[PDB]
């Protein structure tokens, strides 16, 4: 499908497991070197650095990852509500870079390390 | 710019009164209607004439004029030369789906020619002999009597 | 409204010559050439053989086709020639582009117009 309508359609309608790819980000130099991948599906454990938004430059821990909306929550990247409350400002993993990994999962780390699969 | 292109604005599009380009009445009838009444003009007259013979009782002859043969004798280098001698059958195209080959005598014959075909016309003969040549009637040509 | 850029130049050149040089044939041809393709000449050898004469360049303001026989040793000048024509012609004479004629004879002298 070279057609814009179908392209957008397939992204917006991809089943749950096919959304993981929409929450991927580039990996710092060290990390690409260490595992042999250019980017990784951000996990709520990883640390990351904002490279584009108004929060570009800031670094923080990934607090949440939504697959439906293809967005993430990074600690301290927030907005001032009217009532004074502070809420997270959603980000696109495309403007983010993972500087640290949470590898408490054998499986993820298993995937990361192997050279025939990517995490 | 085309004629059609310029019609926007003319209203009528070159039909005169807007009361014109309606139905077939503006044509005097649908199809060839009136070919015998109002528009009999320029319509071949009515009736039947003659007859036809069954398609498969009809013989179609493949014809050629001396002039054609003669104008290219030299060029037909791939054809006998003698005291030229050409079998027409090999010359004429369509000489397969034809019931036979016939030489016609139109034009001139500037060479001495030996012609072999299934049938010739007086003129073709006279002309071909008149140039010190001969006409040879094929075995199929053996149908003269 | 001629489409051919070549036929278009030839005509231009034919004009340039007719004016400068004293020619009248060139301007004449220029005009025929500007006329509708259908009006241009299509002449077979059979005709050229019939009305041409040695040392008098035949000018065909059209194309020459190879039907018939040409024996005379004449110089024919046309817009173009069927391969057959230019072949039969060079066998007893010489086939020449009008562009070349304009150059070897800008006064358009001793020329015969055939159509």
């Amino acid at each position: 499908s070279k057609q814009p309508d179908k392209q957008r359609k397939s992204q917006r309608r991809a089943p749950l497991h096919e959304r993981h790819k929409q929450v991927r980000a580039t990996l710092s130099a060290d990390l690409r070197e260490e595992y042999g991948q250019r980017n990784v599906r951000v996990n709520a454990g990883d640390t990351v650095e904002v490279l584009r938004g108004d929060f570009a430059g800031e670094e923080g821990e990934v607090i949440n990852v939504d697959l439906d909306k293809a967005v993430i929550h990074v600690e301290d990247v927030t907005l001032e509500k009217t009532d004074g409350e502070e809420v997270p400002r959603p980000l696109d993993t495309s403007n983010v870079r993972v500087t640290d990994l949470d590898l408490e999962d054998e499986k993820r780390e298993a995937r990361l390390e192997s050279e025939d699969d990517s995490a | 710019t085309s004629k059609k292109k310029r019609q926007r604005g003319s209203r009528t599009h070159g039909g005169g009164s807007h009361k014109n380009r309606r139905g077939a009445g503006h044509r005097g009838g649908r199809g060839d209607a009136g070919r015998d009444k109002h528009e009999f003009h320029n319509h071949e007259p009515l009736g039947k004439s003659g007859f036809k013979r069954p398609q498969k009782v009809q013989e179609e002859a493949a014809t050629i004029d001396v002039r054609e043969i003669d104008e290219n004798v030299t060029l037909l280098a791939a054809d006998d030369v003698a005291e030229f001698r050409v079998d027409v059958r090999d010359v004429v195209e369509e000489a397969d789906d034809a019931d036979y080959v016939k030489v016609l005598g139109a034009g001139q014959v500037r060479h001495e020619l030996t012609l072999i075909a299934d049938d010739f016309s007086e003129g073709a003969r006279e002309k071909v002999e008149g140039a010190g040549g001969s006409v040879e009637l094929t075995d199929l040509g053996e149908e003269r009597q | 409204s001629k489409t051919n850029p070549r036929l278009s130049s030839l005509i231009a050149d034919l004009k340039s010559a007719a004016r400068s040089s004293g020619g009248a044939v060139w301007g004449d041809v220029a005009e025929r050439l500007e006329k509708p393709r259908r009006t241009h000449a299509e002449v077979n050898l059979g005709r050229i053989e019939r009305y041409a004469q040695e040392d008098e360049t035949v000018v065909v303001p059209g194309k020459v086709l190879g039907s018939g026989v040409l024996q005379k040793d004449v110089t024919v000048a046309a817009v173009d020639f069927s391969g057959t024509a230019e072949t039969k012609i060079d066998q007893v004479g010489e086939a020449v582009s009008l562009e070349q004629a304009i150059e070897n004879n800008p006064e358009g002298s001793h020329v015969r117009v055939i159509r």
Binding site: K2, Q3, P4, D5 | - | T3, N4, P5, R6
Partner: protein, 246 residues
Amino acid sequence: MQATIYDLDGNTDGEVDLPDVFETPVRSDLIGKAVRAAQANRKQDYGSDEYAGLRTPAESFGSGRGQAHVPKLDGRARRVPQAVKGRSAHPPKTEKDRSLDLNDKERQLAVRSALAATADADLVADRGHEFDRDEVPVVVSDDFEDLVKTQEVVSLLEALDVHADIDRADETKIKAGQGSARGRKYRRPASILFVTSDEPSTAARNLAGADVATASEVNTEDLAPGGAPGRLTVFTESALAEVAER
């Protein structure tokens, strides 16, 4: 004429005779006609629904209610062309023939002529191509066909001082208009045509605006994209010899 062959380093390596075809008079008018035909021939048939706007029993009340004689239903006008939701008077039709016929002779003549235009440094410079060379078309050793890396064709192109033309086509144009919505958002200048002999250069193809072709089937389009003659071409020692018989 003479043709300067080049080795994969960009250094002269003998020379061959530029086949006759490259001497055919340039007829951009016939070329254009053949490119036009090619482009129409790949256009797809389309047409609105035969029944679009006719799906209803609407009827006209005629005279009597101070209303115009227009077919209506549930008090809403329908079917007629001047009525919203009505049929399209004269719509696009599947049935229409959108193809173009072109005499083989007329077409083949256009190919040779496009070929010829390739050998004119002036035409190629006018068509728009960027390069600092004097001879054209660029002819190269058959070893070109073994290249595998794009990057290598680049050095070879920079060595032949022809790489500036890819620099030219290394810019995209986001068109004006709705083509966008139909997957035609972009468009880019046509650069160099590489014509090999056994197969189309897999090493060159991805080059910015480059098109690859084979000597036996290269056409009037690759030879003169858009009907414009004079494309900066680079043949292969063998290609150049095959082309000659086209």
